[model samples]
Target chain A: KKPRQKRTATKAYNVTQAFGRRGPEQTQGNFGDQELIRQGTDYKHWPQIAQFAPSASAFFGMSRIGMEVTPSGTWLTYTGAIKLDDKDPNFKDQVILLNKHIDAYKTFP
Target chain B: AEASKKPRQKRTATKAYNVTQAFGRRGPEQTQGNFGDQELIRQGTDYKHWPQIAQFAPSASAFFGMSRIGMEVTPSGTWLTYTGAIKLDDKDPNFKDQVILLNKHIDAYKTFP
Candidate 1:
């Protein structure tokens, strides 16, 4: 959702850069404020993504499917043994955990 | 950044009714031209009655079933705000496709009157 007001990026950088959950503390914007990344986002074929990787787990949980639940299945279930948190259930769990770190990016001082 | 051309358009009818009743030839022409501009505002403003972009919102967003979400650029790239499901879903368009439609609508508006 759009913030009630425009937000300024902390340590704003015009230069292209990326960060992982491990990099620094995130802002943790309010409930509806966080711009969770989507799986369909054109993140591929980008130089920044390849170099930084941007916290695999956080990115995974950020997807629509990752954070959502269907009547039958849920990302947190972690039942699939395939890839992208499809297999190891712990993978999604880890992803959910990482989301906390990334969500802080929504909040700012 | 690129060359462009606009197709020809119809002109508005110049005649207006005065003291007496009358029909003019430019009836269709004027309406066609005026609505061309009017429809631009119509579609964008009409979208509220249609499905919401709530699909773009996060799950934690309250009343997810009723409304949608919003996004804004914040300092240091983060903020709380307000504003999706497809499966067992209706004929709603995908996130990318819907954006394209609305964007083109806006573009068409700016591209013309």
Candidate 2:
């Protein structure tokens, strides 16, 4: 398959996005926590989470995702995301990029 | 003058829970449950707690617990001293552990960590 943009750039940019989501009406992930503490468990495997998010979102039909842990087990919690307006910067590119991965990932689910 | 009846305190979501915020879905009155589910499912429990066991689910959508057989309820009610979490969007593939997790949480309600 042909690539739209450099994988390296997208990966670097979205790796940040995928971890600890935050915005106007949201929560900041453990971004401010000490680097090791953040990475130890909460932020560990974030790179893979970044890679897997599009697929996971596609599978679950949601955008906001997080972990729900309980005494018996754990689960992936998700819900819909707020729609972004057209005038927003990067709007065009994000749709193009996310949809591409979403379609590709959903094909298997 | 006759003594006035006291008003019950309104239960608030943010007040009931601590740091880990739990998102609950709202829905019609409950049609199913056991002792604990009804025990906790009461009129004023709108957002304070998650009550009941389902197909081991988030109970589909949220529901207001009834007042009880005689009383006026939210729609419809825990024996467990501690609060219990109902089915959520996700479940352990094993299924059985869902119940185990629930029971354990109920067991530790007062001492919930």
Candidate 3:
């Protein structure tokens, strides 16, 4: 059998984008307001919460990325990042880079 | 002439030290206070005094006494006397102590410390 080729940077970036869509409103209908839900979370309404990578970080464990709106009705995007292990592989690399410019359908009112 | 009812004075005395100018602590490095884990404690307390076992009983040293005693109709006599000093300290016995203590006395309030 031929050896499988490693995924390219484009593929990895695309994969990351896929992971980013795990926000609350996109998946769950009425889970209510969870404090830890910040801006960008992935695979939220799955049968098993731990099955999703970001959900594990937000719900199963501590630290996650979430989106919230400001009282003035501006869609304020934020990432809820916390250090589980200071020396993790991606510790030095910025795990959560908030994209404030991107506005969702709903406003912060 | 109507006898006016006066406002009750606060029993506990407290002092605030405003050293903001002297120390000049600000930003994240402010040595005056760090509201992180300590903030969680303050949140649960909702900025009020922590209640103790003796506080509810009124007389700290008495066997059974509370905030008030029903009117002594038949014989008026001194039921009990509270002599020992009572202090409502905030130090938790353990991690679970806060949950138990707060649940026990719903009346005990806390200030954001």
Candidate 4:
């Protein structure tokens, strides 16, 4: 049976570089209270795709399965991980579960 | 003329050593990019390079989850800040976790329309 207690963990994430191209005309004025702004963003590659690299372990914990982001206007992506307590016995088991979840997510429509 | 030779010899020896090292180790260091390149820091308006991109071992799935939920990491390593409308977990019944993904911040003045 699954445990009823709610478990929470924190993971560190590095977005690395969020690459997008914008024209100089997109900026407002560079003066006083008037500042430049992002007129629109075109995500080159999905953040979810980049986060799966083997090197990602440095920032994520085991339990975190995967993350998905949606904006009211559009979809954006970022990496995420589960935070684990060193003493938690369930930590290792949860990590195993997370791996399965991740594998399954790859096939998610 | 003899006195001039002593200081000149020291300079020549140091220059020779530097040239040899630069030529010999250039290959591997060049491929990976020079670690000593401090130009980014100099151009940046910060000190000690206090703001940096550090590696965090985040799992692929969790990242997807956060992205779906709309949460992001902050530079200070503190808490997740919400930019868009805050959502509760119940919106998607298929998933049991109460994880929230952000969408976008609301602009009240847009009501002018």
Candidate 5:
């Protein structure tokens, strides 16, 4: 009999906190107060800032496979691992999909 | 007055080193170009440098699962961040123990020296 797999909630509070700490310093002067205020007071900008907020959390509990950032560009790598039984039929396709996503991110720029 | 003659000193053996062998001349030049001008080189050689390094090691407790994602961003005319995700396969006995997923993200304005 196959064992039941459970989905656990992953939290990225630390990552988001770090980003929040640095966000003000980095975004300062680049976007004026009026512009930011116009966008929203809760965040520097609603959509753009909102996009990364969730993203920061999404990175919770993942391994950093590689990272390279230059003035010209940035590269961030991560990996996650799971355990499964040998009888699973979807394993091959799933792992391939995972690798494809990694490659895609590597070459995104 | 005649000056006194000094005793002959023995020659010391030294190991030969080649900068060219370690890194080709053009390779160094290319690295310099990629890093920008000479000022950048000086600063990099000093305390401040381009491309800051961050290190992290994931332990058993830190491990979440057999899936991961990552991303990267570059600055051209506009900011572009590429992202992806992956999951592991359970069919293979070798990989059945674990499956790995990986991906990345990008921030255009964020940069290093």
Candidate 6:
């Protein structure tokens, strides 16, 4: 056999910048501050809450029609036409009309 | 003797009128059964019985922090201050009692949604 020879080995590697380096803080906080300021201005133009009072009253009135939360603690949901007494001028006719449309849609299904 | 002669500064009568006005705004349309459903459930079936309904009234001004002086106390001891105008007219003899009854109703309504 020939004389034994010493073993030799070589290795090579390469690396490239695949993506941008990330910073410690990723999100900007000032965006939130800007949004808050905008919201404050929006509130100034918001419609007066008092305007909805009459409509709210009408909705409650509809609940009396065929709907009952039983005195004995049982709850039942019913659907029916909401008719308002004309004697009370305070009752909004426009609200009644809206309820009629709502009743029709509810009954459609 | 001097204290007795001092005309007792009667609490402003306008306070009563203010309370009554608030009730008038809230009751007929806002709270009571305008069509059928009693917004305040405590009113019950007897709509005509004022005494019965009176038991369920609410304290005036508490809900919205309304006060003639523009300062009100919340249930949790927090203070609510408003800059809006406040007006009171207590001239009616029956206004004081009316306000009391309205407050009861308001309180009762507040107990629920």
RMSD of each: 21.1, 18.7, 26.7, 23.7, 24.4, 28.9
TM-score of 3: 0.15
lDDT score for candidate 2 against the true structure: 0.25
Locate the minimum summed-lDDT window of 10 residues in model 3 chain A: A56-65
Model 6 lDDT tens row, B1-113: 12222111111112222212212222233223322213333233223434333222212211111111112234433221211111112454654564444444433433433
Model 1 / residue A41 / CA error / Å: 28
- Give the range of the ten consecutive residues with the poorest summed lDDT in model 4 chain B: B101-110
Report how far residue A104 has shifted in candidate 4, in Å: 2.1
**What is candidate 4's lDDT per residue for B3-82, written digit by digit as tens?**
22321111111222221222111112211111111222122112222122111122322222222221223453212111
Best by lDDT: 2
Q: Which ranges of candidate 6 are over 4 A from the true structure? A: A1-109, B1-46, B49-88, B109-113
Docking class of 2: incorrect
- Model 2 misplaced stretches (Cα beyond 4 Å): A1-87, A105-109, B1-25, B28-97, B100-113
Instruction: Give a tens-digit lDDT track for model 1, residues A42-75.
Output: 3232221122121111111112121234564221
Write the residue-wise lDDT of candidate 3 on A26-53 in tens digits: 2211111121123112223221211111
How would you encode candidate 3's per-residue C-alpha lDDT over B51-96 as one tens digit per residue?
Answer: 3211222111010010111111123321111111111223435424
Candidate 4: tens digits of C-alpha lDDT, residues A1-109: 1111111111221121111111112111111000111110122222323223222212211111223445532222222322233355554553443343322423433
In order, how many clashes per candidate?
37, 18, 13, 31, 20, 12
Candidate 2 lDDT tens digits, B1-113: 01111111111222243112221222221311111222232221232333322223211001001000011113211010101122233443645554454444231323321
RMSD of 5: 24.4
User: Residue B96 of candidate 4: its Cα lDDT?
Assistant: 34
DockQ of each: 0.03, 0.01, 0.01, 0.04, 0.02, 0.02
Stronger candidate by TM-score (2 vs 3):
2
- What lDDT does candidate 4 reach at residue A94? 37
Q: TM-score of chain A for each candidate?
A: 0.22, 0.28, 0.18, 0.25, 0.25, 0.17
lDDT tens digits, residue span A1-109, model 5: 1111112112322222211111123121111122222222233323332222111212221222334444533333343222222244654543443344232322322
Better of 1 and 6 by DockQ: 1
By TM-score, who's the top model here? 2
